[PDB]
Paper text:
Here we describe the crystal structure of the [name] from [name] SA-01 (TsNirK) at a resolution of 1.63 Å together with its biochemical and spectroscopic characterization. TsNirK is a homotrimer with subunits of 451 residues that contain three copper atoms each. The N-terminal region possesses a type 2 Cu (T2Cu) and a type 1 Cu (T1CuN) while the C-terminus contains an extra type 1 Cu (T1CuC) bound within a cupredoxin motif.
However, a single crystal was obtained that indexed to C121, containing the entire homotrimer in the ASU. The characteristic extra loop (Asn181–Pro191) and the tower loop (Tyr164–Leu176) of two-domain NirKs were observed within domain II. Domains I and III harbour the copper centres [Fig. 2(b)] and a calcium atom from the crystallization solution, coordinated by residues of domain I, is found between the monomers. T1CuN is located at the top of domain I and is coordinated by two His Nδ1 residues (His75 and His125), Cys115 Sδ, and a Gln130 O∊1 residue in apical position. T1CuC is an amicyanin-like T1Cu centre with the His2 Nδ1–Cys Sδ–Met Sγ ligand set and an additional carbonyl O atom from Arg389 trans to the axial Met ligand. Structural data for TsNirK suggest a potential electron-transfer pathway of T1CuC → T1CuN → T2Cu as there is no exposed hydrophobic patch through which a physiological external electron donor can potentially interact directly with the T1CuN centre. The most likely T1CuC → T1CuN electron-transfer route would involve domains I and III within the same subunit [Figs. 2(d) and S3]; in this pathway T1CuC might deliver electrons via a hydrogen-bonded His431 N∊2–wat–Glu385 O∊1–His125 N∊2 chemical path to the T1CuN centre.
Author numbering:
A (entry chain B), C (entry chain A): 20 to 444
B (entry chain C): 20 to 446
Write the structure that this text describes.
């Protein structure tokens, strides 16, 4: 058949926990984005629309043909149409791909999902039992970051199944003892490895990449690096109670990646568990505990604020050898399309040094990791507009008077920071 | 056969290097715990006893049947009895499972071990040679943490084979050139991946999860994430000398995960190398150079102490636009069933904000990641008790007078921290 | 056949990005080192020479026989000769092996490379097509570190294919639509996992370790931990354009691990891409923007400098209910054959505590992780010499007068740090 899907690139807000909101980028106002399911040999038609005010694009791992000419560098308001044949069965990632630096920077902000290509060849348990699964479960594991600095460092704030911390503890997935389950698992990462496990289960058959040829049997874990996938076949044992789904990378399980398969003889067949996030929200309620934003300003502001005391060399003349010591500059890094620290408070007389730690400094716009810092809200006498900095390039500003400045990158306008200059009354 | 094993949950202290002690939890006073070996098709009876003052439990990956109802949420002094059939051959992890948050928090404190299910189908090198191994080696790789903060961040202090840094450098494993070795390897993690390697060897046959069907041949490395396992068959080449066992993740090999197979023509046949820690101690000697405790107070105390100077906004009135700036609070995180920083020294007038960074705030007791802070050693006029905080909830306290305080969490009484408040003697 | 290769251990400087220089250790002045290619069943003769002023050695994973007796603990000026038979086909790492602690410490400084053992049994796509590859590509992924602290913590500064950030973006690899490519991939790490991917491709056949028996089919990623390898067979789809080679661990792709296969119908047949770095330099030019050195002093110096104010307990007498508080010591760690922080600036009256965080404290020289700290080129009134510290051992020094001290480890003389003591004028 011919199958058609529409993906819409957008800026969004995701509710990842009770009272916890994440700012980022989506397809169709959900993270993970819409789940696409086709059969091996189908023609797949994609319409990609950019509804945002920055450039986006698309990579789709089910296509064994050129994609970036057709689906990259999609400007604000532009549409693309692309078709391909699904020649390889299994479980595939899709994600945003503006091109260059932006492929990595946008993917980590929420722009990812799953496409399943169901094989003509039946999986082994289906063949052996003469019937299809009693239940199919589709799961994405993914990470959320508090800053571009933390993204470079591999320090995830939350890790989750289908876009919400402990989603399937709050709403346990109903199963029955004796059910043939088929699980479709994709770890999008983007940094951390996963080892998927069910407490009370040994997976009978698993298929690396979801291809029926790549058979592994009798496993306690399914090992998956970023963008690795598996199809897993397992019968629920003939005993009632909770069979917990978890990653055995326990420093990530503790951050949200744990759910429950609740086995009861009379359990209802509910709507299909798709690898899709909850719909995004329109605004942040005033009752929020935390707002996470890797690229821009986050709440509460005080947990992202660095207040620097006066350097000992500025408080008075001090020295080591011959002449007086100069004060040390205070660094603000450009890193992972963000400014680190996000909010800096310094005393009059301090020199700030911007430094670009992003590495890919070719191309332009959302395809580049070059950055500048340009004031957009001026409450002081010393507004600033830095040059555009390549990797490892630097720019110094000395602040001599009190004031407060909100600034952005002109190339990537969702990058935002604050400098405040204080003085004794 | 029917096979019976007894596991005893307890609080323990492990000597992980010369003069270096680690506080945590165990089964039977060793980390890794008792190694269990059965045959495929055996009936396995487990007796679990809780000898500690907090709740514990057990998960056992060789069981393909419901376990949490029968072995979870085991109260202090309680016993459970459970049986299952070993239907699947291989190398399996077992670990503590109070339930919920505690599964992750207790496992990282030391409560893990191995159960092996030997297959009825013989492995390929045994079949080909017509005999069993000349020596079996059972190995667990595991991590130790200085704090729950470091646990969240994946920053291990030590990484080790069978519970002690460079154990098999200090005591090399005797083998002979030409020996048929069979290695049973489990990476328990709980955070880091392993690539097992022997210097001077290429592994002939390997079996993912220890299942004979999952064959990989001719490998320089055996890739294993947390709770992944392998069985490996290899012949020692016909040349004497040291063949070093190591993980090729070299930032973890450097932390303790390296040992020696010492090949000599006249080497005695030693008893099998079991995947079990050295038994623990009851007191820490005065000779100790370091005490590590992820949940509580560590030694020396100064290496875990943050001393804050007076906020510039408190030192005098300061301003940006017009009105004076407020001082920033000093943060104490509850994270990985610990307080971070462990010891905080602040000047009078300072406000502390407790914030709960643990995420799972459901259930109760050892099953929850809710926390409070309650003073239990009062050496000042301002002892305190916070509410019980869920994820991302906060509580502020302003300290106006000098003093010191040791506090715990009432939910998890092994969590411990210190606040000291200082003031110039001139006042 | 009988094949002979010469490896020369030395100290080197690599240009890993434009204007960015990395100090470390090499074979033959390139990182990765020379690529060695043999056939299954060949006798391989190695000549190892140590051209440096510290001990080096060699481990070679293609040898299934004792190596360390013959190639370990190679003193300055020494030569070793070693032969073995290549009995196992695939893609193997080699690296420095002085012994003990130094195996890990030297390998992370750049001393690694690839040896390929081509199988007698033909790979599947070569069998099916009746001909060899149109182009062979040999790729190493490796990491670079700013400090031994960062090495312990898994925090790589750069991650790259064949020794230079975005090398194959700056110079894309020409291919033709329809080409049979065979890729020989080795992740040397030494810490991070990789998931190798081509944008617009699904890998047809892959071989774990490069052994023809270990077949995996139809994959979007090839998962590889440190020292894991693959051989990958893939046909370029019949469409012109760029097919991007990348690791899906996107926090490492963003640090330099991304390249381009540029597909054109009229592309010339270039020479095979060898898994070898760019030859090093003898001096760092005036133009340089960054010098990285995990063991020693880096540039600019101020980005590695910690300046401490006077302890509140030294400023004035303070107490917590009883007698006056003592000041807390300021820690310098010995960790990963380096001092952390690299540069420390402290006020007169401050006590410093050196602590050895390296764990392996047996053996001697480059085989041990024992360390001391000793002032060279003395130009301050209070020079120091610490004892040689084992793991977790400590030593205190109280500084009472102003001055500057450059210091080294006597055991590992390339380790270097600075302490400066300041005083009000
Ligand atoms: Ca919740
Ligand atoms: Ca030791
Ligand atoms: Ca560049
Ligand atoms: Cu995008
Ligand atoms: Cu991709
Ligand atoms: Cu920018
Ligand atoms: Cu427990
Ligand atoms: Cu488990
Ligand atoms: Cu608690
Ligand atoms: Cu070396
Ligand atoms: Cu090696
Ligand atoms: Cu040294």
């Amino acid at each position: 058949a011919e199958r058609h899907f529409t993906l819409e690139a957008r800026s969004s807000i995701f509710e990842v926990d009770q009272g916890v909101y994440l700012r980022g980028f989506s397809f169709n106002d959900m993270s993970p984005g819409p789940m696409l399911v086709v059969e091996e040999g189908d023609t797949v038609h994609i319409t990609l629309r950019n509804l945002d005010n920055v450039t986006h694009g698309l990579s789709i791992h089910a296509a064994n043909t050129q994609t970036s000419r057709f689906l990259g560098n999609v400007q604000p308001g532009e549409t693309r149409e692309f078709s391909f044949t699904a020649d390889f069965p299994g479980v595939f990632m899709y994600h945003c791909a503006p091109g260059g630096h932006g492929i990595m920077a946008h993917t980590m902000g929420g722009q990812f999902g799953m496409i399943v290509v169901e094989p003509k060849e039946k999986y082994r348990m289906e063949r052996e039992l003469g019937r299809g699964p009693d239940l199919k479960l589709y799961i994405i594991q993914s990470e959320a970051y508090a800053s571009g600095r933390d993204f470079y460092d591999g320090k995830a704030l939350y890790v989750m199944f289908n876009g919400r911390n402990f989603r399937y503890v709050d709403e346990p997935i109903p199963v029955r003892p004796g059910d043939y389950l088929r699980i479709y698992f994709l770890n999008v990462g983007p940094n951390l490895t996963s080892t998927l496990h069910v407490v009370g289960g040994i997976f009978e058959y698993m298929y690396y990449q979801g291809n029926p040829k790549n058979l592994v049997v009798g496993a306690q874990t399914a090992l998956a690096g970023p963008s690795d996938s598996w199809v897993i076949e397992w019968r629920v044992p003939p005993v009632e109670g909770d069979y917990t789904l978890v990653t055995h990378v326990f420093g990530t399980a503790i951050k949200g990646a744990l759910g429950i398969l609740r086995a009861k003889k009379d359990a209802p067949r509910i709507p299909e568990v798709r690898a899709e996030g909850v719909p995004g929200v329109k605004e942040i309620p005033a009752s929020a505990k935390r707002v996470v934003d890797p690229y821009g300003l986050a709440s509460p502001g005080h947990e992202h604020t660095v207040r620097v005391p006066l350097d000992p060399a500025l408080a008075q003349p001090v020295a080591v050898g011959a002449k007086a010591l100069e004060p040390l500059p205070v660094t603000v890094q450009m890193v992972g399309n963000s400014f680190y620290p996000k909010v800096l408070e310094i005393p009059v007389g301090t020199t700030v040094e911007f430094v670009n730690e992003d590495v890919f400094d070719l191309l332009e716009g959302e395809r580049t990791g070059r950055h500048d810092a340009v004031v957009i809200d001026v409450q002081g006498p010393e507004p600033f507009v830095t040059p555009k900095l390549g990797h490892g390039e630097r720019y110094r500003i000395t602040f001599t008077k009190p004031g407060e400045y909100v600034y952005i990158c002109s190339i990537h306008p969702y990058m935002k920071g604050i400098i405040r200059v204080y003085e004794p009354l």
